[PDB]
């Protein structure tokens, strides 16, 4: 394994980003806020908050060399990034220490200049040096042999705004007011015992999630410390609600994280607030009932849309709850691990 970093184009330099430094974390926020993923028509761009990036990028076992930035030599402007975080991954009959690759991003001015290939080779090298030789990642780009392919679905919470910014459109013979009526939700959840997750809930959430994930073919394997990190509620980042039965025992939970998108060209609407279905576990509450209450809670918290993939058991509630299929397709890839492809309903892994 090569011990020196791979050579960058002249005028560019490697810099590991200290996300515990507020200035540097804002530098990464700015890079992603201005250059990260857009929709096909360049109307929306992800707007990961600084506090979200710190949550996504420093889970248990994070390493500083795995927060891999590129800067302009003369000005020190941040112009490239890629990240890896450790994760224990179950894939069919095997559970293996891998990394999750995320947030690959090159400044718009620097594209088509073969920087992203180097970012990928360098993070690969830095992961190899830790003895880890597999990775999981997702992308919209179709690379060869995805282990799985999921599609986005969208549940309109604020339909007028979505239609106005052209995130959505009126269906045939539909009108604005009739669409608002169609997507109307109850104002309070209906499941008895539903409440935000607390510290005391960490062990039961861990046990519930570990037993529930076993039925899928690609899942995380989380310690209790990782459960605490990924699920303990943090306002405007991660929401988790547990169902406590009449004897005081948690039987189900739901979770969704906060990922808004900049709206580039609308005279009045500047941001699209989206909720992303994370992990949802049911053993006593029907999943349909669980997700109906997820929609209600997201609506209450001012989200404009609730987003979900067709993975795990989601297809059992997507249409019944008036999700509309999106135009986006998400491929899951495993690096240096051959195995058969699987349907979306056997994928049990959600990245940020």
């Amino acid at each position: 394994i090569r011990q020196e970093p791979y050579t960058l184009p002249q005028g560019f330099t490697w810099d590991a980003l200290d996300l515990g430094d507020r200035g540097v974390l804002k530098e990464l926020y700015t890079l992603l806020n201005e250059n990260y993923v857009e929709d096909d028509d360049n109307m929306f761009r992800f707007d990961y908050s600084p506090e979200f990036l710190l949550w996504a990028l420093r889970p248990p076992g994070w390493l500083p060399q795995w927060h891999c930035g590129v800067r302009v030599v003369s000005s020190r402007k941040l112009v490239g990034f890629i990240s890896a975080i450790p994760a224990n991954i179950h894939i069919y009959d095997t559970e293996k220490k891998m990394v999750e690759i995320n947030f690959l991003c090159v400044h718009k001015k620097l594209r088509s200049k073969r920087v992203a290939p180097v970012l990928i080779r360098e993070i690969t090298r830095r992961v190899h040096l830790e003895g880890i030789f597999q990775a999981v990642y997702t992308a919209g780009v179709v690379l060869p042999k995805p282990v799985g392919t999921c599609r986005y679905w969208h549940r309109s919470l604020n339909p007028r705004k979505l239609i106005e910014v052209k995130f959505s459109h009126l269906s045939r013979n539909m009108t604005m007011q009739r669409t608002m009526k169609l997507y109307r939700l109850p104002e309070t959840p209906k499941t008895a015992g539903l409440r935000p997750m607390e510290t005391k809930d960490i062990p039961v959430v861990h046990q519930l999630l570990t037993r529930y994930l076993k039925q899928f073919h690609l899942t995380p394997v989380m310690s209790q410390e990782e459960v605490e990190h990924w699920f303990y509620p943090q306002e405007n980042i991660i929401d988790t609600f547990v169902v406590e039965n009449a004897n005081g025992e948690v039987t189900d939970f739901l979770s969704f994280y906060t990922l808004p998108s900049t709206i580039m060209n609308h005279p009045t609407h500047k941001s699209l607030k989206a909720a992303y279905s994370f992990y949802n576990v049911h053993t006593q509450t029907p999943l349909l009932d669980l997700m109906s209450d997820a929609l209600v809670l997201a609506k209450m918290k001012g989200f404009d849309v609730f987003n979900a993939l067709d993975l795990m058991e989601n297809k059992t509630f997507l249409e019944k709850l008036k999700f509309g299929i999106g135009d986006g397709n998400l491929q899951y890839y495993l690096y240096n691990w051959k195995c058969p492809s699987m349907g979306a309903e056997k994928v049990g892994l959600v990245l940020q």
Binding site: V37, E38, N102, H154, I325, L330, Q352
Partner: peptide, 8 residues
């Protein structure tokens, strides 16, 4: 997170 999808 990797794809900014909208309604189809």
């Amino acid at each position: 997170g990797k794809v900014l999808s909208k309604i189809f």
